[PDB]
Design a protein around this ligand. Structure first.
Ligand SMILES: [Mn+2]
Ligand SMILES: [Zn+2]
Length: 198
């Protein structure tokens, strides 16, 4: 989990959300073993976005090749404990928009956050991904974690970009205010290997 100072920093950064604004949530991975989480406020562009190493490797490899394309080695350096830390400090009685509520409901409940309510926009599969190509063209650089070829060859599913494209689908245009991450990379990732000296 997080250190005392990491925990103070996270809570401080999370208060940059307005607890009342429209807020999307999306996860990749099963709710008992999530590997990527995004919480996004379209109007101001702010988002919480972080990763998690999986515990079930066989199911992860399946999800990797047919959904999110994440290589497990790229998760080794991510900061543990962020999922429970973030969910614990989301505002009381917060309301979240999502596309498909079943898994996210389980995840919040497992964290005793039954006070958090979900609004399932329940779009149809392809309506939800109308602007998938344009959103990936513009905002690919915001998440480079989907490195594997995914087959169902299709575009990998990213918690962050899914939130952005669902927002685009609800409003009818890929034109959204610039997304800005509220978490620092040093909170999402551990230090990683030293610079190779060249
Ligand atoms: Mn997704
Ligand atoms: Zn991603």
């Amino acid at each position: 989990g997080l250190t005392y100072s990491q925990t103070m920093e996270l809570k401080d950064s999370m208060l940059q959300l307005d607890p009342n604004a429209k807020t999307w949530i999306d996860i990749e991975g099963r709710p008992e073993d999530p590997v990527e989480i995004a919480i996004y406020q379209p109007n101001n562009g702010q988002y919480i976005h972080f990763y998690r190493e999986p515990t079930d490797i066989k199911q992860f490899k399946q999800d990797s090749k047919h959904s999110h394309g994440i290589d497990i080695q790229d998760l080794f350096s991510v900061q543990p404990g962020l999922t429970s830390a973030v969910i614990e400090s989301l505002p009381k009685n917060m309301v979240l928009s999502c596309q498909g509520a079943d898994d996210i409901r389980k995840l919040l409940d497992s964290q005793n956050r039954r006070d958090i309510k979900l609004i399932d926009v329940s779009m149809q599969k392809d309506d939800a991904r109308k602007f998938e190509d344009k959103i990936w063209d513009e905002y690919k650089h915001l998440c480079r974690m989907h490195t594997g070829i995914v087959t169902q060859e299709v575009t990998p599913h990213c918690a962050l970009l899914d939130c952005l494209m669902f927002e685009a689908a609800v409003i009818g245009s890929p034109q959204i205010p610039t997304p800005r991450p509220v978490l620092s990379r040093d909170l999402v990732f551990r230090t990683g290997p030293p610079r190779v000296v060249l």
